[PDB]
C-alpha cells in the first residue's frame, strides 16, 4: 500500500516492484550490479554492497586496465590504463512513466566523485527518422559533479534526429529543455535526503526533500529506460572532451574508497 510522496487525495498509485528494493539484501536477480563499462573506471560486482538496510555503491582507487573508446581519435584502445573502480545497480527491468524515488547519502570525499540516480535506455540507431529518439536518459540527481558542493544537477540527456541526423543532447549544450540546476539547502554528504522525479508522457518534474527543484517537458524521454543508482568519477580525476571522459593525471589514492549509500529506491506508476 506504499505510496509515493505526491500522491494526491483520492489517487491511487501502484509500486513496480522489479524497479524498486529496500535494500535489505544484495538482490542480483532485480539487479545488474555489473554493467558495460564506460567513463574512465570499470564497475566491479565487489564494490555494490549491502549491510544492514542500505546499498553502499564505492568507488576505489584500483589500477587496470581495460579495451577503451577514445572518440576524440575514433578509435578502440586496448589495455588502456584505468585508476578507479566503482559501484552500480542497474534494474534489469525498464520503464519509463511513473514517479521514482531514492534516499540517498552522497560520498563524504569532494571533488573526485559524483553519485547518481538515473535511468536510461539503449542506443538505437535503426531510428533514422527525423525526430527519431535514439536514446533516453532522465538523471534524477547527479550529486558533487560541480564547484561547490551543494550544487546539484537533475538533469535530461538524449540523441534526436535533426535534420537527418543523430543529434546529441545534453544539459550544458541545450540547458533550457536539458538543465536542472539547483542549489541544497543541506550538504548532501550529510545524512540521507530524497531525490525524485515524476515522469509523464508530457513532463518530468524534479523533487529533493520533497521540494520541486526542477520541471522540463518531456519532449524525448519516452523511450524504456532501466534504473540506476550508480558512481562516476569527476574532476580533479577526470578530463572531458569529445563528448566523453578521459583520465587526469592526478591518481590520488587520498579520498578513496568512498561510497554514496542508499536507503531505498521506490517506483511508482498512477493509477
Ligand atoms: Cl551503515
Ligand atoms: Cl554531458
Ligand atoms: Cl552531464
Ligand atoms: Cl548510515
Ligand atoms: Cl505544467
Ligand atoms: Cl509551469
Ligand atoms: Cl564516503
Same mark, same amino acid.
Given at each position: ?13 501502484? &509500486?513496480?516492484? $522489479? *524497479? ?13 550490479? %555489473?554493467?558495460? +563499462? /564506460? ?17 553502499? &555503491?564505492?568507488? $576505489? *582507487? ?13 578509435? %578502440?584502445?586496448? +589495455? /588502456? ?21 531514492? *534516499? ?168
Amino acid at each position: 500500500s506504499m505510496q509515493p510522496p505526491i500522491a494526491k487525495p483520492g489517487e491511487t498509485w501502484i &509500486l513496480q516492484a $522489479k *524497479r524498486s528494493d529496500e535494500f535489505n539484501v544484495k538482490d542480483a536477480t532485480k539487479w545488474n550490479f %555489473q554493467t558495460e +563499462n /564506460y567513463g574512465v573506471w570499470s564497475w566491479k560486482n565487489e564494490n555494490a554492497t549491502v549491510s544492514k538496510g542500505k546499498l553502499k &555503491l564505492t568507488t $576505489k *582507487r584500483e589500477s587496470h586496465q581495460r579495451t577503451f573508446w577514445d572518440g576524440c581519435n575514433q578509435q %578502440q584502445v586496448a +589495455n /588502456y590504463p584505468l585508476y578507479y573502480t566503482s559501484g552500480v545497480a542497474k534494474s534489469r527491468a525498464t520503464g519509463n512513466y511513473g514517479y521514482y524515488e531514492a *534516499r540517498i547519502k552522497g560520498a563524504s570525499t569532494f571533488p573526485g566523485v559524483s553519485p547518481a540516480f538515473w535511468m536510461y535506455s539503449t542506443i538505437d540507431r535503426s531510428l533514422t527518422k527525423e525526430g527519431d529518439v535514439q536514446y533516453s536518459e532522465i538523471d534524477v540527481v547527479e550529486l558533487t559533479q560541480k564547484s561547490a558542493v551543494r550544487e546539484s544537477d537533475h538533469d535530461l540527456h538524449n540523441i534526436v534526429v535533426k535534420n537527418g541526423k543523430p543529434t546529441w543532447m545534453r544539459p550544458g549544450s541545450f540547458p533550457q529543455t536539458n538543465h536542472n540546476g539547483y542549489h541544497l539547502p543541506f550538504d548532501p554528504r550529510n545524512d540521507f535526503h530524497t531525490y525524485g522525479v515524476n515522469v509523464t508522457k508530457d513532463k518530468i518534474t524534479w523533487y529533493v526533500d520533497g521540494e520541486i527543484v526542477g520541471e522540463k517537458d518531456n519532449l524525448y524521454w519516452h523511450r524504456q529506460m532501466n534504473l540506476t543508482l550508480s558512481q562516476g568519477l569527476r574532476a580533479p580525476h577526470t578530463q572531458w572532451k569529445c563528448n566523453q571522459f578521459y583520465p587526469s593525471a592526478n591518481k590520488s589514492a587520498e579520498g578513496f574508497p568512498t561510497s554514496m549509500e542508499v536507503d531505498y529506491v521506490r517506483t511508482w506508476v498512477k493509477v
